[PDB]
Design a protein around this nucleic acid. Sequence first.
RNA 1: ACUGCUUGGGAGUGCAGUGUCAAGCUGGCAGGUAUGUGUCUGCCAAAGUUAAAUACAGAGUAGGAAGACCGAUAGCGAACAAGUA
Lengths: 95, 203, 93, 144, 39, 56
Amino acid sequence: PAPRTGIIAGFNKGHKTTRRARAPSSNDRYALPHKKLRAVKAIITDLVGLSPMERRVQELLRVGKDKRALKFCKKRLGNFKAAKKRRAKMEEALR
Amino acid sequence: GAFMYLNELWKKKSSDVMRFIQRVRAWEFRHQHTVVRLRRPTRPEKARMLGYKTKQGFSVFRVRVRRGGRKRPVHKGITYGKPKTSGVLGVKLNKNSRAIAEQRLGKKYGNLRVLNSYWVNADSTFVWYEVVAVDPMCRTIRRDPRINWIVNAVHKHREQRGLTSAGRKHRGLRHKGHKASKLRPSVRAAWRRNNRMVFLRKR
Amino acid sequence: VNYPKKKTMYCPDARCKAHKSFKVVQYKAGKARLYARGKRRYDRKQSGYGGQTKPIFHKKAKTTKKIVLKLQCSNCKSIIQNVLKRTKHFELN
Amino acid sequence: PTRFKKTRHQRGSTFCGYGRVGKHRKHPSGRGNAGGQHHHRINFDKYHPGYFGKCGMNHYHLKKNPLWKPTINLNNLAKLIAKDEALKAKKGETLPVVDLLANGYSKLLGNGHLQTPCIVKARWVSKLADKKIRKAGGAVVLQA
Amino acid sequence: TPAPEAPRKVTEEERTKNVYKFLKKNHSAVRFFGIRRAR
Amino acid sequence: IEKKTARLVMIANNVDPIELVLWMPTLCRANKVPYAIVKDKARLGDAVGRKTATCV
RNA sequence: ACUGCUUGGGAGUGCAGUGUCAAGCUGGCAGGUAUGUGUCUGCCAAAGUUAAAUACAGAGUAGGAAGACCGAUAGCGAACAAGUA
Ligand SMILES: [Mg+2]
Ligand SMILES: [Mg+2]
Ligand SMILES: [Mg+2]
Ligand SMILES: [Mg+2]
Ligand SMILES: [Mg+2]
Ligand SMILES: [Mg+2]
Ligand SMILES: [Mg+2]
Ligand SMILES: [Mg+2]
Ligand SMILES: [Mg+2]
Ligand SMILES: [Zn+2]
């Protein structure tokens, strides 16, 4: 970690303590992929088929109605990031 | 990892297979009493998350609850006093529907002690939460370290006191920190603590 | 009151510091936008069961109002604006 | 002490200083600050002129700890320096050193005529303090 | 609880540098850091 | 099934929540474990000496 | 999202209803002004128990210590067969 110079203001503003980079514990493993949790979810998608939303989005995604998809999903998910990932992953299931 | 399959199968409630299973049930559940005991949970994996264990003295109940907002029970729909306090149809109950189902059940059957409830199904008119009541005086319960807290008198009607997970949800206790400071031991406790007129003995 | 469609009024801009003919446009108040700081309050305050929660002014007495004139020198965008006397029929030409 | 109230003086004088006419009522005007914009308008405008209105930008969830920057002037650095230690402080010699966080001060405003040098040690300084402090032969050393 | 302390010392190179323009560069450096990127 | 040590599997036809096993045929199909649905959890029951078996 | 209550919480503090309804292969939530985006920081919700320090603001049980308090029109309604006649 960048040493923080003894000055009060600036790009490293602190008391000149010797900072310790660290992090590992267990919660950082949430950032990691759950390859097995996807194997499961993939097994459920090919079981259950698609959602009425998820089908309704692919019908739009057939047509060049790309923007009416994520703009349909955000209404159905709230998140716009979530709306993109869903349209994103759907873009593959359609591919 | 059978739970992992059965847990994500239920994360697809909108899938047409799960939408069909749920359809038949809500049909099937409409033609049943508001409370219905089950020898087994509809959702074994979900009941078990909430502390249900297939043991003696654990029993499951599917408690129905009408959906939609509260109509405030003023006579002829009239309301008196200030115009703010008027409004019959649109004011909503400040209580959860898992809470109301945990409370219907725990009041019908004071024999027991509800542990948790989970959503089971919901047609247009009703929601079904299957409660996991423990029977305090089953010996299996009394003698199991993981569960015998429920036996202690402090939890007699946890649900009526809003202690169950549902009753902590509407009670705001799903938030620590700055989003629940006015709420935090309790809304009442927060109120005392702020509205007390403290008189330090020497001021 | 007829008003000239253009005027050599004095200009505060550094580019100017001089009299310049100004393209006169009448000031019409802008649209009352939804996410004005105080519309959001009024909307939040109109949610619920109190009826009207703030007064609505009803009885006007003014028949006329001051005619603000937005101006702008040919030189630049900046819009100096200045008031006139009340009139029942301002109309530049 | 109840003995001393003029309640006790005017025991016998029927209206307790409230007047025979114009009787002592209750709330002859409203509770508290009622009519601050009406019948007490002359009052707030005379005495509490800025009382009504809004003036500036909001600062939602203000945290004053981050904002904490208490100040000590050059003219007051004798409060911190030991009088014994401060005894001989030629600018070209050794100087008392004065950490200001220890003493509870953050910035160093450069007010009056400092003349006894010190190596002030503080988080902030005025344009005029570091200048004065140098011209006295002392030196601020920045800390945090 | 252990902590730092200081004695006392002759002023050295400190007499030359103005710590303010040092303090104020470093403050301004952060304060207008986002506005000096766009320029 | 997942470890694919199973070399045949016998899902029961009927189950209180079919959800318990509803996924299972897709899971054997994925691990390419042979599987069969069979008429009653009661027969997988007695076959295993249990009064019901969701699977074998 | 809408509605409604609620909050100091302010383009939403918490909640509820209804609709909608995720993610976990640049995860999620918080980071007190909305949005899209990029960094960084803390966290890891939707299951559970848990003493002590705290309340007793018209309770009780069993005791105790008091008072710059009242002193029989006072102090509790009740110093008495008083929540009695
Ligand atoms: Mg007199
Ligand atoms: Mg008087
Ligand atoms: Mg009189
Ligand atoms: Mg008077
Ligand atoms: Mg009079
Ligand atoms: Mg203010
Ligand atoms: Mg209120
Ligand atoms: Mg979790
Ligand atoms: Mg008496
Ligand atoms: Zn100009």
